[PDB]
Amino acid sequence: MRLLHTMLRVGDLQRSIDFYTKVLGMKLLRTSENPEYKYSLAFVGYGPETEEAVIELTYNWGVDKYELGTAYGHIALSVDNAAEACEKIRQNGGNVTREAGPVKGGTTVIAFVEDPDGYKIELIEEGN
């Protein structure tokens, strides 16, 4: 068994698609639309659904805003260069809430950012 995906409702499908792909480097894996339930989906990830856990972006027709709440935490993604990522994100529809840097009493470099809809994303970096 394995983790397949995490679904998040977005206010604007293409906007989220652009962010996850163009900014974060993911690939659009597949899309779909459903007239009965009035929604469109977009699956984005760093690998195919058979190989990795991805993200399910859900767009409910005519719905551009939700209540984030206080329960949901975030999604953590690995990055080659957190600082670079941060800059790219902040300049392309995102927001940096925690500048890139080591964790207190640690050496591991991390950052926290927000996507176009306010979703928190944790970036974890993987002799200049």
Catalytic positions are 122
CA–CA distance, 44 with 65 (Å, rounded to integer): 20
Smallest distance from the beta carbon of 41 to Co ion, in angstroms? 8
Binding partner of residue 75 among a copy of itself, Co ion, none, CB under 5 to 8 Å per kind?
Answer: a copy of itself
Cβ at position 50, least distance to a copy of itself in Å:
7
Please calculate the CA angle 70-112-75 and round it to the nearest 5 degrees: 60
Q: 39-58 mask for a copy of itself (x: CB under 8 A)?
A: ------xxx--xxxxxxx-x
Binding mask 106-125 for a copy of itself (x = CB under 8 A): -----------xxx--x-x-
Q: How far apart are CA 99 and CA 113, in angstroms?
A: 8
The residue written with tokens 């007239």 in the block is 35
CB-count burial class (<10 Å; 0-12, 13-18, 19+) for 85: buried
Which parts of this chain interact with Co ion (CB under 5 A)? 7, 56, 76, 122
Residue list for the binding site for substrate:
9, 60, 74
